Every structure is written in structure tokens, then in C-alpha cells.
Design a protein around this ligand. Structure first.
Ligand code: NAG
Ligand code: CA
Lengths: 123, 272
């Protein structure tokens, strides 16, 4: 599903401030990462990235194309293609703790300034 | 004849834009008898200071082109522009290169007429309000500011994709657009970066008059997300000097003059 910035912001609250990344920064990162499409699937040099957070099967989740993946998140990549964001968020937190925000290539170039526009005022 | 008024008296404002009824160019031509071979139109009632080349990057989207022509020709005539329509068709099977095709359109259009303004438009975007003028302004103009795709709003303030317009001087000033972006994404952000580096700001109409419809379509396997896009946009300040109008090379395979437009099929090479 193609979510809105506010739908996304409300769903990822538990991630706010984790590893020092705010909700504004995440709204910005997710728009440029998947266009807020929970079913996004992108290939990238022999590997596939899934969902809202574009979590890769290279190390993070297990896919049928690449079954011996480290599957660090301990989850099937298909669980990242639905609208229940709790496990997508749990896996993102593992990426943040282990690898850091730079796993998301959109962060530095697109989310280093003009963060206010990303605020959701809708309760 | 004297100068066309600042605002056209022919505008109707909001329009219904639907992609239901199939189009027939023969009919479009029938309805637009004033459009000359190659899709050129010049007002007869007044003199327009806007000599506009409208550049459409393109690859296998004829059904989209039909709708684009069906809606834009009447709009552009109402806007009282001295314009020409150019469809830059990418031959080959390499990933789609939107920016490079726009650069080719700039160079090729200039061979036909002394255009002073260039509108760069995706072939699937139709403006829903004719007060959203397809011409150039004192600063770079972003036109498709409220696309239905983004809920009829601007997705981010730095967004310069979709439909935009640059005067010839503005375009020249940034060394045109990058040629090195292959595949989907980031080339428009690179363009945005260029304008900013040259000290320009982005002019836009408000979100109401900027309402724009996007014809729907399935993913283009020939235009998948560019893996290098995020890195590339971080180096625009330096690369805009060596990648642009000044390094543009390509081969023209065919120039086709149809009654509603000029289609130029080109071979723009492969990822370097
Ligand atoms: C670096 C990148 O991917 N930028 C894309 C841009 O090319 C596109 O026009 C816009 C709307 O879809 O979304 C951005 O995220
Ligand atoms: Ca999920």
C-alpha cells in the first residue's frame, strides 16, 4: 500500500530517536527510500530490497532467491511486504544498531537539511 | 498585431482530465487545424514573447503520447504560446536516460527555431488547470507541483521532477542537464542541485492551479531504480562542470515530422 507521510510517521513512533534519528528524518528517508510503498521491491546488484524500509535479503531477511542469507533479522522477506509495520520497524532497529543510518543511502543527500517540511501535525 | 496580453483571455481554469475514451490523432488534428507540421503553433491574433520548445523524453509509450497531445495542444494554444512539440525517443535497450534525452531535445529544437524557453515534460503528466502556464519565468519554473500521485501536493520542497521550464539562459547557465544518470531516479534532484549552485531559486504556481494528472502504468523494467543515484547527487557541484551540454554526444537515427509533433529517435549510447 502507498501510505501517506502522516500514516508512516504515526506507525514508526517506537523508532523515534533510536540511534539519534528523529521522526522527521525518517519521514524524509522513507519517502526517498520506497516512496512510502509498503510493497516496494527493488533489485540492487544480485540482491533484493523489500518494503517501506527497503530491507535487503543480502544480510537481513531470508528470501527464496537467496536462502542462505545471514537473515540477521530472523524473518522472511515477505513479512516486509504487508501493512503491519511492527516487524519492519524491529528489523530497521537492528540495522540501526548494527550498521547505522547510512544503510539508508537517501539519508545524507536528501535528509540533511529542510527537515521541518517532514513534520506530521495530524494527531 | 501587438503583444499578447500578460494573461490570456482564453483560459477556462480547472478542467476534467480522464483517460477513458480512446484517442484518435486524426481527430486531434481535426480539432487543432492551426497546428502546423511538426507540431508548431504561433498565434495569429497577437505576438507572443514566449517561443517555447516542449521536450518530452520517450520510449514505447505511444498510448501516453496520444493523451498528452489530445489535452496539451488545446491548452497550449489557449495559453497563447509560440511553441513546438518534440518527442525524444530513446532507441536501444539500455536503461532509460530521462535527463540526457531532455538535453538532446534542447539541442535539436534549437535547429528549428530560435526558442527562448524550454519546457521539459514527462509524457504521462497532464495539467488540470490552464492557468498553469507552460512557459518560462525569471527563475526556473517547476510546473507539476501537485500531481495526483503525491496526493495533489509537492512531495518535498526540493522536488523538480515531472514538468519544468527553463529559459535558454537558465539552462545554459547550469551547463544543461546531466548525461550520466541511467535508470530511474535522482537526475531531477541533480538538476535541482545545479540551479541552486548557480544561485537560482525555484518558482512555482500554487497547489490549486498546479494540479496535475499522471496517466497510470506498470513498472518499466527498462527503467529500474539507479543503484548509483544517491551517490551521484552528492557530487553535482563538481560533476555539473564536466557532465552536461558540453559533453553531450548522441546519434540521430530519425527525425519524423508528424502533424502534431516532431519525433526524434536517437542512440544516446550506454552507461559509461
Ligand atoms: C534520488 C531519488 O531517487 N530521487 C527521486 C526523484 O528522482 C523522483 O522524481 C521523486 C518522485 O518520485 O522521488 C525521489 O525520491
Ligand atoms: Ca510487516
Amino acid at each position: 500500500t502507498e501510505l501517506t507521510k502522516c500514516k508512516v510517521s504515526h506507525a514508526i513512533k517506537d523508532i523515534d530517536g533510536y540511534q539519534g534519528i528523529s521522526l522527521l528524518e525518517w519521514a524524509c528517508v522513507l519517502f526517498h527510500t520506497s516512496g512510502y510503498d509498503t510493497q516496494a521491491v527493488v533489485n540492487d546488484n544480485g540482491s533484493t530490497e523489500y518494503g517501506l524500509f527497503q530491507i535487503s535479503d543480502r544480510f537481513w531477511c531470508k528470501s527464496s532467491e537467496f536462502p542462505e542469507s545471514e537473515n540477521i533479522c530472523g524473518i522472511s522477506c515477505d513479512k516486509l511486504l504487508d501493512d503491519e509495520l511492527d516487524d519492519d520497524i524491529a528489523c530497521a532497529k537492528k540495522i540501526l544498531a548494527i550498521k547505522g543510518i547510512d544503510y539508508w543511502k537517501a539519508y545524507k543527500p536528501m535528509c540533511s537539511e529542510k527537515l521541518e517540511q517532514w513534520r506530521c501535525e495530524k494527531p | 498585431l501587438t503583444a499578447c496580453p500578460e494573461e490570456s483571455p482564453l483560459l477556462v481554469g480547472p478542467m476534467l482530465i480522464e483517460f477513458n475514451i480512446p484517442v484518435d490523432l486524426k481527430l486531434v488534428e481535426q480539432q487543432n487545424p492551426k497546428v502546423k507540421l511538426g507540431g508548431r503553433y504561433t498565434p495569429m491574433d497577437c505576438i507572443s514573447p514566449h517561443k517555447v520548445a516542449i521536450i518530452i523524453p520517450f520510449r514505447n509509450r505511444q498510448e501516453h503520447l496520444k493523451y498528452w497531445l489530445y489535452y496539451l495542444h488545446p491548452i497550449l494554444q489557449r495559453q497563447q504560446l509560440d511553441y513546438g512539440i518534440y518527442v525524444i525517443n530513446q532507441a536501444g535497450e539500455s536503461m532509460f536516460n530521462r535527463a540526457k534525452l531532455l538535453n538532446v531535445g534542447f539541442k535539436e529544437a534549437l535547429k528549428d527555431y530560435d526558442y527562448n524557453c524550454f519546457v521539459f515534460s514527462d509524457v504521462d503528466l497532464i495539467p488540470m488547470n490552464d492557468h498553469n502556464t507552460y512557459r518560462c519565468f525569471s527563475q526556473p519554473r517547476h510546473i507539476s507541483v501537485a500531481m495526483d500521485k503525491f496526493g495533489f501536493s509537492l512531495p518535498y520542497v526540493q522536488y523538480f521532477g515531472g514538468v519544468s521550464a527553463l529559459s535558454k539562459q537558465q539552462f545554459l547557465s547550469i551547463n544543461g542537464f546531466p548525461n550520466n544518470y541511467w535508470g530511474w531516479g535522482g537526475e531531477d534532484d541533480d538538476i535541482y542541485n545545479r540551479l541552486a549552485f548557480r544561485g537560482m531559486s525555484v518558482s512555482r504556481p500554487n497547489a490549486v492551479i498546479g494540479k496535475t494528472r499522471m496517466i497510470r502504468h506498470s513498472r518499466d523494467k527498462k527503467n529500474e531504480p539507479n543503484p548509483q543515484r544517491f551517490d551521484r547527487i552528492a557530487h553535482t557541484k563538481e560533476t555539473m562542470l564536466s557532465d552536461g551540454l558540453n559533453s553531450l554526444t548522441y546519434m540521430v537515427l530519425e527525425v519524423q515530422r508528424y502533424p502534431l509533433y516532431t519525433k526524434i529517435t536517437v542512440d544516446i549510447g550506454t552507461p559509461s
